[PDB]
Amino acid sequence: REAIIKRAAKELKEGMYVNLGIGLPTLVANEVSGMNIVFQSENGLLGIGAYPLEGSVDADLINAGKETITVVPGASFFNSADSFAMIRGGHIDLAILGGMEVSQNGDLANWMIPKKLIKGMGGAMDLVHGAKKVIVIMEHCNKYGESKVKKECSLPLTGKGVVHQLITDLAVFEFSNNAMKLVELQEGVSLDQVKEKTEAEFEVRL
Amino acid sequence: MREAIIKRAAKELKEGMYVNLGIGLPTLVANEVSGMNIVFQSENGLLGIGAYPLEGSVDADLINAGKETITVVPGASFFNSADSFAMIRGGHIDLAILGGMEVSQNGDLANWMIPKKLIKGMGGAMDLVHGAKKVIVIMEHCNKYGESKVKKECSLPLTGKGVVHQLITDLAVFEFSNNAMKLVELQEGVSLDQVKEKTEAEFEVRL
Amino acid sequence: NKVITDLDKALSALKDGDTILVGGFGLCGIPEYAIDYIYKKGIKDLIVVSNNCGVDDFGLGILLEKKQIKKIIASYVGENKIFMLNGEIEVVLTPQGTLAENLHAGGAGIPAYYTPTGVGTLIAQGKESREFNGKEYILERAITGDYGLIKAYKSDTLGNLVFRKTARNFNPLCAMAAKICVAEVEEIVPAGELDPDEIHLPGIYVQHIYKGEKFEKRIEKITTRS
Amino acid sequence: MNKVITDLDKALSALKDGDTILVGGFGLCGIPEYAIDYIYKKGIKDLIVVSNNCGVDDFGLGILLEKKQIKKIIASYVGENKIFESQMLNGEIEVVLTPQGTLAENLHAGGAGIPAYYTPTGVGTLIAQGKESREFNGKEYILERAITGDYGLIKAYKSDTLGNLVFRKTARNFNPLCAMAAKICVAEVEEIVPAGELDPDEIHLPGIYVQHIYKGEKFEKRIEKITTRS
């Protein structure tokens, strides 16, 4: 899993405005500390800081995952419509999201499992359309050995053809014109290994 | 002429109202209501318009829709142009008072353009006629040619169709319901016949 | 002066079937006293528009106990367990950005607008779609309500509000799109004490102002460093 | 991430003939004097300008009419420029008059990623011509389309070094709208302060919307009508 976070950290660049989705993507913040980066919170903040000190907590200040946070110098607050104007308006450089499934067409399913987990999409559907670049990071297979990189999603979609890049513990994939392409192997992973654990059809570029 | 119009228009202002006064005649109505709790909105992003500044308190960053330097009352707020018009379009303004070149019997209003003569633009007038909870037009009854400005159909480009709730002129007060116009008041020293004579629009007499 | 000392002054006429717009994100920026008045009085069959349902024992979750909510429009229930499969409550899941913009449109007199969000998902079902410049967008409808119930930090007597940090969220949107808005605040100051350029919500959107003695301001997940 | 510039060329150099500029201000209130001056001196032409007004004859966007630098303008009112109407009648400039609230919201839509929306404003008038019309909830609306531009040219009060802005009074107007709807936004301000000096809850325009920050030495802030009391 560290291979996922670290590899995703390399996608951040100086001067970017970035939204990290809940789950794995929040860990990416820790790998980037030496960079000039502004993190956006869809609940109405630009400039998320570190988690506070015990006793320095403030209930009016939290991230989209409902965690107590702090702000950086030059942060700003705004309302939810302002917030999704920023996102939908294409102002966010990068959105990193988790997923239950990704297909070869760049489709992401991350909000529900029918008659199992219904929780909701939150702002994920806005983010997948608005962000200049959308990155999904995710474990290649689940608990039971099932591939989460698929020919087509079996779960309800968060978006169709919205994923630019996918990073798993096995490989790195990129998406162009309905085609999936393997661009990198994670350290200690073999092409054969990936071809085996991936249902999705993809062209190999290494 | 204007005096009877303005003073009658002032009677429409009630405590606790949020009001927008269009440029020209309507702005004069504020002077008749000097001590009243009423919030005037300026479409350029202010709520709580206030008196002209004393000499030396002049501030270029603070003006009314008419590009005049003003002040603000306590509890005023500033906001951007989308917000201003969201407030207007969203139906939050109780009263908009406007001037007009023509008003039709159907409640149509023409106040922004005279073809090949007067072209400036509509500014916020089109937004105000739809959004305001009540739309009052105040206007001189006849033009400089002595011709009626209250018509069966407007000859000038419309500011809005069936938007006028109440029309106050130097002659009479009219109300609009059911695409239909009622004469509900005669101004002081004015006769029913003077109004009939000076009005092209068809109306019901509700005095 | 819109200041009231009794919530019933503002809420007396709220009845069963009414549509209420409730501010807050998770437990952050929630109208605790308003939600409380409704739990006590037992208003039923409410249609609720809120980003979340709160949590099992707090926020909007409260009203679920006696099943006062027939229908809720929200983007996320994720923090809540008890929270449906029964069918006793209809849940319209809306993308958060759409929810926010629907409310904004409602307050701004805009009936409908297009958004790319939700295209090619269940969200697009039963909605008009259209193309603009090679991209597909779906048509979303404004939301309005009978009562806005919002939380803010500070108000003046004219109902001008300022919010605090991420507590703002949906709050101003609920005010603007609701016929009758009541705001509960931690501080009230005389008109003129709030700078015109510091005001978040102009008082024209606020019908009533209520100072709560104490807000619990519960935190769902407390995360600290070193 | 320093957006501060002391020379407007570092900002506007790529501005070319035929570009679309969104320009803040209401009358002469809250106008970007320096960017306008910059365009005036450099001679850029065939410009498509989006602004509430055209300024006046000798100041604001008006000075751009001298060399006939604007091909088309989208505005809700002009009225104050004799030289303007001269070019309008002659037809040397295409004018599209738009309801002020429509102009504002079109800009909002453009910054917010909304391609089109429905509005009651302009129904049953010349503005409705050539536009889709619908009925919603027993009322008539027309379809309005978003406005975007290559450059937003805006004026504000203060900026921090991150580009967070605050405006003052009615100077704000269309300025933030022009910012969000434009690909490249250049804000000119009276003061630039360190990050942290502007309270996050007092900030009007988040810095994500500002590409370049320029501190003007002296803004004229001309007043069209000075009205006083007593």
Swiss-Prot record, chain A:
Entry keywords, A to Z: Transferase
Enzyme class: transferase
Catalytic residues in the record: 42
EC number(s) reported in the record: 2.8.3.5
Alphabetized GO MF terms: CoA-transferase activity; succinyl-CoA:3-oxo-acid CoA-transferase activity
Gene3D superfamilies to which the protein is assigned, alphabetical: Glutaconate Coenzyme A-transferase
Reaction catalysis annotation: a 3-oxo acid + succinyl-CoA = a 3-oxoacyl-CoA + succinate
Membership in a protein family: Belongs to the 3-oxoacid CoA-transferase subunit B family.
PANTHER family: KETOACID-COENZYME A TRANSFERASE, SUCCINYL-COA:3-KETOACID COENZYME A TRANSFERASE SUBUNIT B-RELATED
Subunit composition and interactions: Heterodimer of a subunit A and a subunit B.
Name of the protein in its database record: Succinyl-CoA:3-ketoacid coenzyme A transferase subunit B
Organism per entry: Helicobacter pylori (strain ATCC 700392 / 26695) (Campylobacter pylori)
Gene (name only): scoB
UniProtKB/Swiss-Prot annotation, chain D:
Binding site for CoA: 24-30
Record field: catalytic activity: a 3-oxo acid + succinyl-CoA = a 3-oxoacyl-CoA + succinate
EC number: 2.8.3.5
Family matches, as InterPro entries: 3-oxoacid_CoA-transf_A, CoA_trans_fam_I, CoA_transf_BS, NagB/RpiA_transferase-like
Presence of the UniProt keyword Membrane in the record: no
Principal EC category: transferase
Molecular functions per Gene Ontology: succinyl-CoA:3-oxo-acid CoA-transferase activity
Keywords: Transferase
Keyword Transferase among UniProt keywords: yes
SUPFAM superfamilies noted in UniProt: NagB/RpiA/CoA transferase-like
Subunit structure comment from the entry: Heterodimer of a subunit A and a subunit B.
Family designation: Belongs to the 3-oxoacid CoA-transferase subunit A family.
Name under which the protein is recorded: Succinyl-CoA:3-ketoacid coenzyme A transferase subunit A
Higher taxonomy: Bacteria, Pseudomonadati, Campylobacterota, Epsilonproteobacteria, Campylobacterales
